[model samples]
Target: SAPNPKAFPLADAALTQQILDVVQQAANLRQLKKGANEATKTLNRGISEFIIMAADCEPIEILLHLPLLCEDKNVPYVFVPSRVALGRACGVSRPVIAASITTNDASAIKTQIYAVKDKIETLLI
Candidate 1:
């Protein structure tokens, strides 16, 4: 059972790998906001390009507002099945339930960001 029916557009295995790869690259570039609070800040600041949430979060309610906010902001979001894997992708040792990759047009991974966003939108459709 999942938390919300609104948690649509979850990533598949292949897309999950691609999302994690982009997350890893974003971490290296210092463009990642690692945690629900920080991710919220990114969204409020209008710098978030996309959001990633962990589907396994206990209660799941803690990060639920994020998906709504992402929609309000017109940013694409997707859930990965594992928080531990999300943490690893963000270069953190602990689990990460939510994260945002801030936008930087000049970033080297910009193209990849667009590509991932496109895939996410396809899932939404």
Candidate 2:
């Protein structure tokens, strides 16, 4: 069945791999913020490349502010169905409800990150 229109933009398994790969690489490069607090900080500081959030957050509203912030900052955000999958991608032991992939204008991952961003935007449209 098709997801409801308001389900939030979610990366399919194919692109999910690419996105999570970039996320893992970003973590190794020290460019990822692992929780909602740090993600929000990245947005407020205007250094986020994109944001990835867990769709299964216990209280979904907890991370709902991110979409608004992302819009205001002209950044893109996505949701992945599993918090465990997201945590694994971020190399964390526990689940993560939200995360920000911080921008590194000079970093090697910029191009790949942009590709993911483009895919996410298309999902919205």
Candidate 3:
């Protein structure tokens, strides 16, 4: 399998839907990273709680380095099945291949982060 198996480390539609709901809330709270570059920076800065990547990204490899970086940073990551869907969650019209849900409290979105982190950690193997 590829390092981050597209078929394995990904959320199914239902889970993706739940994740998107939280993502929407996160966005409103200003706790989300909307693109690959920014997501990378978040991980590098050690502020990202976990990463959500789109498995349908062109070549997919465009965001491949992120998993390695996340591992090095001791952060977790999971892939959603579609870039279009990820974009929708990101509240953007165009497809978004990667995003980071940064750590922030004082919002309802904070309650869901641990669940996401656990799911991402489950994908590590």
TM-score of each: 0.93, 0.91, 0.88
Model 2: weakest 10-residue lDDT segment is 1-10
For TM-score, the strongest prediction is 1
Summarize candidate 2's per-residue lDDT along 1-125 as a digit string, tens digits. 23334438887889778888999999888989999999999999999999998877776778889989988998989987778888988998988878898878998888998999999888868
TM-score of 1: 0.93
- Candidate 3's displacement at residue 52, Å, is 0.5
Q: What are the clashing pairs of model 1?
A: none
Clashes per model (N, Cα, C within 3 A):
0, 0, 0
Error of 2 at 118 (Å): 0.9
List ranges where model 2 is wrong by over 4 Å: 1-7
Candidate 1 lDDT over residue span 56-100, tens digit each: 877778888887898899899999888889999999999988989
| Residue 61 alpha-carbon offset, candidate 1, angstroms | 0.3
Question: Judged by lDDT relative to the true structure, which candidate is superior, 1 or 3?
Answer: 1
What is the Cα-based TM-score of model 2?
Answer: 0.91
Global Cα lDDT for candidate 3: 0.80
